[PDB]
Amino acid sequence: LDQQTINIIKATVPVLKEHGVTITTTFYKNLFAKHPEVRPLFLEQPKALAMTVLAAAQNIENLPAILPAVKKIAVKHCQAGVAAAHYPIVGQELLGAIKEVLGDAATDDILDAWGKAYGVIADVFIQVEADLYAQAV
Amino acid sequence: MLDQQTINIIKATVPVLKEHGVTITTTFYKNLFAKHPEVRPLFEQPKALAMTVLAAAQNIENLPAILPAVKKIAVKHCQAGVAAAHYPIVGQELLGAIKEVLGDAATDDILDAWGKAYGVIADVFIQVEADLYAQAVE
Numbered sequence A: 001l002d003q004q005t006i007n008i009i010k011a012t013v014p015v016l017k018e019h020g021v022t023i024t025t026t027f028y029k030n031l032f033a034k035h036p037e038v039r040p041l042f043l044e045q046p047k048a049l050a051m052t053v054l055a056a057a058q059n060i061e062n063l064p065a066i067l068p069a070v071k072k073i074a075v076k077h078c079q080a081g082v083a084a085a086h087y088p089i090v091g092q093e094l095l096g097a098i099k100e101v102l103g104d105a106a107t108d109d110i111l112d113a114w115g116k117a118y119g120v121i122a123d124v125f126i127q128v129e130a131d132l133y134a135q136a137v
Numbered sequence B: 001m002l003d004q005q006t007i008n009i010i011k012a013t014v015p016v017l018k019e020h021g022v023t024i025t026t027t028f029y030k031n032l033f034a035k036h037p038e039v040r041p042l043f044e045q046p047k048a049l050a051m052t053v054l055a056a057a058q059n060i061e062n063l064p065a066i067l068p069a070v071k072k073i074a075v076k077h078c079q080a081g082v083a084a085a086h087y088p089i090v091g092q093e094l095l096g097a098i099k100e101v102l103g104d105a106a107t108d109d110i111l112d113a114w115g116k117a118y119g120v121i122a123d124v125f126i127q128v129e130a131d132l133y134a135q136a137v138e
């Protein structure tokens, strides 16, 4: 990640958190409508994805700080059947939500920095889970 | 965070440092123990430091790939009494060794990039170990 990227992330995350309810609801709505194939893996509706990504993003410069959380989430993802190829899909629907919320602030550079950040974050869960799947055998 | 020229220097030069491994490792431990006798007790001689840092450095763009190893080394470090403030000293002596081997190739930008890389690497261990020290008290 280049610094302008990190700068965008650091500066905008608080705006996204402000609109959390909206990003979260829009995300899950679109995820499930556009990708019914993931429905089976999941008042008890999931809610934590988008805010967790925001939280990691907030920690983008020191991801090892959030390992204790990442590790336990990894355990549930490996239990549920989450695959590496699922990540780009969740990323797309998350970015679409960030896009709707930022509205006119939704610069391509900004959107592009969010794409990059999610990737980096997703890269951590993907490797940790690969490692846990291997340990299981 | 780490810029490309730095990642570039690391990726390009690690293979050269690994070729001189025996020399960096032996210069490193010798200097460490001679210059910082206070750490002696925490440690049939250790040998894995410098080569492990090189390996991590080689994985500089995807540090999560080496977590299974980092996690296990963390456990031994917390068992031994390793502290965050120890990191800068191990870094100083690793850097002086790198400098000796690179000889005339030891440019300031090269030494600087290694300094930065060591920093990033150490921060991972420092953070996992802090988390493990807490986990021991709850």
Ligand code: HEM
Binding pocket: A038, A041, A042, A045, A046, A048, A049, A052, A053, A073, A076, A077, A080, A082, A083, A086, A087, A088, A090, A121, A122, A125
């Ligand atoms: C970096 C990206 C992701 C983050 C930050 C993340 C975050 C989380 C969190 C915080 C939880 C709940 C943990 C709990 O409290 O036990 C969770 C559960 C879950 N996540 Fe993710 N996740 C990510 C990627 C994905 C992907 C790519 C999928 C694939 C569909 C997915 C599917 C699931 C499922 C199926 C569960 C358990 C759900 C349930 O039984 O309701 N996640 N995730």
Ligand code: HEM
Binding pocket: B039, B042, B043, B046, B048, B049, B052, B053, B072, B073, B076, B077, B080, B082, B083, B086, B087, B088, B090, B121, B122, B125
């Ligand atoms: C990022 C830097 C570091 C790396 C890559 C690293 C790597 C390692 C490795 C691979 C081991 C052996 C683990 C085993 O095979 O169980 C080890 C053990 C050890 N390291 Fe580190 N270490 C680092 C930093 C430090 C620091 C800052 C100190 C403090 C002086 C230190 C002191 C120790 C000690 C005391 C042990 C155990 C030795 C024994 O078993 O007698 N390490 N380290």
